[PDB]
Each structure stands twice: as structure tokens, then as C-alpha cells.
Design a protein around this ligand. Structure first.
Ligand SMILES: CCCCC/C=C/C/C=C/C/C=C\C/C=C\CCCC(=O)O[C@H](COC(=O)CCCCCCCCCCCCCCCCC)COP(=O)(O)O[C@@H]1[C@H](O)[C@H](O)[C@@H](O)[C@H](O)[C@H]1O
Ligand SMILES: NC(=O)C1=CN([C@@H]2O[C@H](COP(=O)(O)OP(=O)(O)OC[C@H]3O[C@@H](n4cnc5c(N)ncnc54)[C@H](OP(=O)(O)O)[C@@H]3O)[C@@H](O)[C@H]2O)C=CC1
Lengths: 263, 50
């Protein structure tokens, strides 16, 4: 029968002091006991993330911006596992509401272009300042902020600059938050996306990853010409994972005389 | 039953027996004449269009 390959144990304590006991065997119908809030779970990494997270029965709180991008997240969990409630980055009260009962909480709110509504400064450092100030307000354990590779505090790019700014602000206000920096991602060097989500779930739950910056980069380093010709800190080894190779993933007369043709 | 068949000149011509229609002898390049391996033998058709 399905087992908690998620967990290390059956009775676990969190940092804030709440006691969490896993019920039954691992599987869809069971409950691990953790409550997780995944900001940006409509997106491309968060989909695999709360696929793995709501697989065993952690009550996943999904904050959504649009009502139609969230619908395929209903089938990844049991009755009462995945929970949808709308929020906006602008309205304080919805961020306040979304992290009231969470044990762990992650953001992957990251946008590669400016909108008429949000520049680079608005979604990366300032939204993260906002939601992580709420995390400090409620004393939620295990906050995780996923960032970008090449996140320098001062850089010609504004994206990378503001990713570094978001890292510095969330490290400033919360000391116990963990900030993870993945490589380029190829779901279907670069890292496969199920490997990034596997690494993130193994970040989520254990002790001794606290206040630790992580580099999640794949096995072998590439150039863009090499990639197109193929088409035509702590690493993985902290959390006991081996990332998949990009090349293996990349694919993912007489008889006619004795047949009959005019019938 | 003759040892050397003649060919209207002083030449040797093949005495065409049953043994000339084989898969070895198929697709040997040659003129339309002086050649064996007809495409329609009762041994070559092998009950075609069955
Ligand atoms: C005028 C008179 C002067 C004549 C000059 C040439 C006359 C030569 C002549 O008729 O013997 C002819 C050769 O000739 C031609 O091969 C064919 C004969 C036709 C030649 C036409 C004559 C040319 C005149 C030009 C002016 C005899 O052939 P041949 O027995 O060796 O040829 C073969 C050969 O010996 C064996 O295959 C057999 O014996 C048999 O198959 C045979 O056909
Ligand atoms: N090659 C890559 O993919 C890389 C990505 N990263 C980072 O990892 C994280 C996830 O990766 P990726 O899948 O590519 O990113 P996503 O495609 O998932 O980014 C979109 C998600 O973030 C939400 N988002 C962006 N801005 C806002 C905003 N103002 N308000 C609410 N939601 C917002 C989106 O909301 P909505 O659903 O409405 O669109 C959506 O949920 C990101 O933070 C990214 O910066 C790290 C390095 C490289």
C-alpha cells in the first residue's frame, strides 16, 4: 500500500510548536497534517509543486488571481485537500487571510516582463516584502522564497537586480526564511522541473535547511548552440537527489506481389 | 542432350533448365535477351495474389 515517501516519520513537530501526526498510510485519502500555501500555483513550477504536495494529503492553500487557470489543480488532491481563495498582491487583507493557518508557505510569484500594472520592482521585491511581512506577522515556520539564478543585488538587468533585492528584503525581515535559486528549467545548465519540485518538497519539511541559500543546477553545463543542435551554497547532494540528464529527457517487392489489391 | 549448344555464331549459349529461376539469379543486370529468370514461371509466382 501507498507509503509516506514524503515524510521522515509519523509524528512531527513544527518549529512554532504545533504537533502534527500523520494519519493512516500515505496516499490520496490520507492527511499528512501540514497546511501549505503556494503563491503562484497556477504557474509552471507551482503546478508540479502542489502535484507532489497534495499527493499525500497536505492541505494545500492555493491563492489564485484568475479563476480559469486554477481548475486543473482540483484533480490533484482529495476532498478538502486543495483549497482555493482569491487574492491580489495589492490588497493586504487577502495576503493576511491566505496565510492564517499555514504551516509552510512558498512564493513563486515571478514575472519576466513589465506590465502596465507591475514593473520588475513591483512583483519581485515588493510583493515578496508584502507577503513575507505577513509571514513574519503570523510567525509561520519554514518560509521558502524561490528566486532566480544570477540574482545579483546590483546588475545591469532589472530582473536579476530586483531578484537580488527581493532576497535581501526577505532575509532582512525574516531570519528563518530559506531562499532557493534554481537553474533554467525544462519541464517538457538547465534542470528538469520535476527535479526542481522534488528538491523543493525535500526543502519543505526537514530541519537543518533553515536560513540556507540553495543552488539547484543540473549535472552538465551547456551553450545555446549545443542545446538547439540537440533539439534539431547547497546543491542537490544536500537533499539526496540526482537530477536527470537533459539529453535523455530531450525526446520526451515480393510480399506486395502476394497480397491482393483490386479484390 | 548435347554438350555444347550453339548460338548462330561460334558462341556458347545457356541451356535453360529448371535451375535458372532462383533468388540468387534474380536481379542480375543484363540485356533483355541472353537472359533467364522470367518473371512468370509457375515456380516464380509462388501462388501470388493469395
Ligand atoms: C562474294 C563471295 C565472297 C564471300 C565472302 C565471305 C563468305 C563467307 C561465308 O559465306 O561463310 C560463312 C561466314 O559468313 C558469315 O558469317 C555470314 C555470311 C554473309 C556474309 C555476306 C557476304 C559479304 C560480302 C561483302 C561484299 C560461314 O559462316 P560460319 O560457318 O563460319 O559461322 C557459323 C559457325 O561456323 C558455327 O556457329 C556453325 O558452323 C554455324 O553456326 C555457322 O553459322
Ligand atoms: N527558466 C525559468 O522558468 C526560471 C524561473 N524562475 C523563478 O521560479 C519561479 C517559478 O518559475 P516559472 O514557472 O517560470 O514562473 P511562473 O510561470 O509560474 O510565473 C507566473 C506565476 O506567478 C504569478 N505572478 C506573477 N506576477 C504576479 C502578480 N503580481 N500577482 C499574482 N501573481 C503573479 C502568476 O500569476 P497568474 O497565474 O495569474 O499568471 C503565476 O501564478 C518564478 O518566481 C521565477 O522567477 C527562476 C529561474 C529561471
Amino acid at each position: 500500500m501507498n507509503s509516506f515517501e514524503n515524510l521522515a516519520q509519523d509524528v512531527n513537530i513544527t518549529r512554532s510548536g504545533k504537533t502534527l501526526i500523520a494519519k493512516g498510510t500515505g496516499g490520496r485519502s490520507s492527511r499528512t497534517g501540514y497546511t501549505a500555501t503556494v503563491f503562484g500555483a497556477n504557474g509552471f513550477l507551482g503546478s508540479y509543486l502542489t502535484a507532489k504536495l497534495a499527493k499525500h494529503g497536505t492541505t494545500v492553500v492555493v491563492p489564485y488571481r484568475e479563476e480559469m487557470a486554477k481548475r486543473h489543480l482540483k484533480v490533484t488532491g482529495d476532498l478538502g485537500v486543495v483549497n482555493f481563495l482569491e487574492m491580489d498582491l495589492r490588497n493586504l487583507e487577502s495576503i493576511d487571510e491566505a496565510v492564517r493557518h499555514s504551516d509552510i508557505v512558498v512564493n513563486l510569484i515571478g514575472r519576466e516582463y513589465e506590465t502596465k500594472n507591475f514593473n520588475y520592482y513591483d512583483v519581485h521585491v515588493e510583493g515578496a516584502r508584502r507577503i513575507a511581512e505577513a509571514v513574519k506577522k503570523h510567525n509561520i515556520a519554514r518560509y521558502i522564497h524561490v528566486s532566480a539564478f544570477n540574482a545579483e543585488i546590483d546588475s545591469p538587468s532589472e530582473f536579476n537586480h530586483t531578484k537580488g533585492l527581493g532576497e535581501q528584503v526577505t532575509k532582512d525581515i525574516v531570519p528563518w526564511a530559506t531562499i532557493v535559486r534554481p537553474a533554467p528549467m525544462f519541464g517538457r545548465n538547465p534542470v528538469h522541473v520535476i527535479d526542481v519540485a522534488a528538491a523543493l518538497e525535500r526543502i519543505c519539511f526537514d530541519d537543518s535547511t533553515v536560513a540556507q541559500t540553495f543552488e539547484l543546477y543540473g549535472p552538465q553545463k551547456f551553450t545555446q548552440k549545443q542545446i538547439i543542435d540537440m533539439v534539431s551554497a547547497k546543491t542537490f547532494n544536500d537533499l539526496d537527489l540526482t537530477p536527470m540528464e537533459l539529453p535523455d529527457l530531450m525526446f520526451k517487392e515480393n510480399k506486395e506481389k502476394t497480397f491482393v489489391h483490386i479484390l | 542432350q548435347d554438350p555444347i549448344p550453339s548460338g548462330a555464331l561460334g558462341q556458347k549459349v545457356p541451356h535453360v533448365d529448371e535451375s535458372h529461376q532462383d533468388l540468387l539469379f534474380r536481379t542480375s543486370h543484363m540485356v533483355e535477351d541472353l537472359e533467364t529468370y522470367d518473371e512468370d514461371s509457375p515456380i516464380n509466382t509462388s501462388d501470388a495474389n493469395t
